[PDB]
Design a binder for this molecule. Structure first.
Ligand SMILES: [Ca+2]
Lengths: 53, 106
């Protein structure tokens, strides 16, 4: 299976450029998935969807 | 590199620059320029006040104006001794904006 966890971060975390984001999805049992990315140096208006990790 | 002259000196320089092939976008607001004449070594950094975008559509360099709020005034004459200004000469995709001059291929 593949499934997408959707999070709206607009007011909660302030993801401007050059910003490190760290985290995990932790299940009831078993090993966590590790989220780890640094947002790009430049965001361009021609490319509103970005691949982060 | 081009250079206006008066008196006994070259007084303004305009250094035209572009990305290398296959480069990721470069954000000039965080660049640094270093120049020396063998007697002094200045280092200069971007002051957002001195941007002219319009020239992407043609005009005269070395006579570009800039916009302090409420007025238009000549760029080169006003630019401080420790700062560099930027003038967009070709940009297809409006990637350069006054607060974030990011240059991309072309
Ligand atoms: Ca561009």
């Amino acid at each position: 299976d593949i499934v997408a966890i959707c999070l709206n971060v607009s007011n909660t975390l302030n993801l401007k450029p050059r910003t490190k984001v760290t985290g995990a999805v932790i299940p009831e049992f078993g090993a966590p998935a590790v989220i780890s990315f640094t947002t790009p140096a430049t965001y361009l208006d021609t490319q509103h969807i970005i691949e982060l990790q | 590199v081009l250079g206006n002259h008066s008196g006994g000196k070259i007084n303004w320089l305009a250094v035209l620059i572009s990305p290398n092939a296959g480069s990721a976008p470069i954000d000039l607001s965080q660049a640094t320029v270093m120049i020396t004449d063998g007697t002094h070594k200045v280092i200069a950094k971007y002051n957002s006040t001195f941007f002219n975008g319009t020239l992407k559509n043609g005009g005269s360099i070395f006579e570009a104006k800039y916009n302090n709020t409420t007025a238009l005034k000549p760029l080169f004459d006003d630019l401080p001794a420790t700062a560099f200004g930027i003038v967009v000469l070709q940009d297809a995709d409006t990637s350069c904006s006054k607060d974030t001059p990011v240059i991309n291929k072309g």
